[PDB]
C-alpha cells in the first residue's frame, strides 16, 4: 500500500519519515473511506460487470470464441469470465489499498508466461479489462469512476 511504499522508501535511506512522506499518508487515510465505498460498490455489481464485459469482449473479438480461439467452448468461455472476475477482484483490492502494490504480486508479474504458455490472447484480455472498466465506470460517480479507471488503465498497461 501507500504506507508500505513510504515506509520502504524511508527505510532504504535509514532515516525517519519526512514531512513530505506524511501528508501523503494523511491524504490516504482521508480518502480511505471513499476508496472503501468505491470497492464495496464495485463488489455489489460484480456479476453484472463480468457478464457485460464478457459480452463486449466477445463482440469486439469474436475470433477468441472461434474454433481456432483459446476461449472456444462453453467451459473455455466460463474460464475467461472467471479470469475477468479475478481481475475485477484485483482492481478492487488495488482501490482499497490505495497503491497498486498487491496487484503486481497477484496477477501481472508472470502473467506474460501465463498467457503465453496457455496460448491465450493478451490483447484480448486487455480488451476484456477495458470492457470491465466501461461497465464499472457506468455505475459510479465521476470522481469515483475516474479513480477506478486509473487502476483499470494501470492493468491495461501492466499486461502490456
Amino acid at each position: 500500500s501507500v504506507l508500505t511504499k513510504a515506509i520502504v522508501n524511508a527505510d532504504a535511506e535509514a532515516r525517519y519519515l519526512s514531512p513530505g512522506e506524511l501528508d501523503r499518508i494523511k491524504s490516504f487515510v482521508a480518502s480511505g473511506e471513499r476508496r472503501l465505498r468505491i470497492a464495496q460498490t464495485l463488489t455489489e455489481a460484480r456479476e453484472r460487470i463480468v457478464k457485460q464485459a464478457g459480452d463486449q469482449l466477445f463482440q469486439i473479438r469474436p475470433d477468441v470464441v472461434s474454433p481456432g480461439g483459446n476461449a472456444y467452448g462453453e467451459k473455455m468461455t466460463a474460464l475467461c469470465l472467471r479470469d475477468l472476475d479475478y481481475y475485477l477482484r484485483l482492481v478492487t483490492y488495488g482501490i482499497v489499498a490505495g497503491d497498486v502494490t498487491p496487484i503486481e504480486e497477484i496477477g501481472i508479474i508472470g502473467v506474460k508466461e501465463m498467457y503465453n504458455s496457455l496460448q491465450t490472447p493478451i490483447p484480448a484480455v486487455a480488451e476484456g479489462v477495458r470492457a470491465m472498466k466501461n461497465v464499472a465506470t457506468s455505475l459510479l460517480s465521476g470522481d469515483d469512476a475516474a479513480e477506478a479507471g486509473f487502476y483499470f488503465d494501470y492493468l491495461v498497461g501492466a499486461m502490456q
Binding site: S1, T4, K26, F28, L36, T92, V96, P102
Partner: protein
C-alpha cells in the same frame, strides 16, 4: 512487509474473496486511527536523541555493564549499543505507523538473538533498554497513542526474550 490493509488484502486473496463488511470495519478502524499515528511519529522523530538519553540513563549506564569487563565497555561497544537502541526505536516507529509487527519480525528479530548470543550481548539488558524507551515514549506521546506505541516495544522485547 505488510501493514493492516495489505495483511487484510492478502488474507482475503488467499481465499480469493471480495472484501466484505467484516474487513471493512477493520479498515475503518485504521482509517480512524490514522491522524494520531502521524502526530505521534513526528514527536518521536524530534525527541529521538532525547528519548535515548534517558532510557540509557535509567537502564544501562552507571552499572557493571559500562565498567571494564562489561559488554558496553569501551567507546566502540557503547556506540554500538546506542546505535542498536536507535534501531529499535526507529523500527518500533515504523511498526506503530504500519499497524503490524511484520516489519519488526522481518528486519530486526530475524537472526538477532543468534547474533547476540554469538557476540555475547546481554539480552536482558537489551530488553530493559527497550522497556525504558517504551516508558519514555508512553510518557511523551500521551494517552492517545501510548498503548499502540507500547505494544510494538513489548513485541520486540518478547521476540528477543
Amino acid at each position: 512487509m505488510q501493514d493492516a490493509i495489505t495483511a487484510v488484502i492478502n488474507n482475503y486473496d488467499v481465499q480469493g474473496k471480495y472484501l466484505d463488511g467484516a474487513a471493512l470495519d477493520k479498515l475503518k478502524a485504521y482509517f480512524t486511527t490514522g491522524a494520531v499515528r502521524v502526530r505521534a511519529a513526528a514527536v518521536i522523530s524530534s525527541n529521538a536523541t532525547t528519548i535515548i538519553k534517558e532510557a540509557a540513563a535509567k537502564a544501562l549506564i552507571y552499572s557493571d555493564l559500562t565498567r571494564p569487563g562489561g559488554n558496553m565497555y569501551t567507546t566502540r561497544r557503547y556506540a554500538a549499543c546506542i546505535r542498536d537502541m536507535d534501531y529499535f526505536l526507529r523500527y518500533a516507529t515504523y511498526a506503530m505507523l504500519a499497524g503490524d509487527p511484520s516489519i519488526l519480525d522481518e528486519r530486526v528479530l530475524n537472526g538477532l538473538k543468534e547474533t547476540y548470543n554469538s557476540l555475547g550481548v546481554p539480552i536482558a539488558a537489551t530488553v530493559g533498554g527497550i522497556q525504558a524507551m517504551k516508558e519514555v515514549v508512553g510518557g511523551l506521546v500521551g494517552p492517545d497513542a501510548a498503548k499502540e506505541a507500547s505494544i510494538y516495544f513489548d513485541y520486540l522485547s518478547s521476540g528477543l526474550s
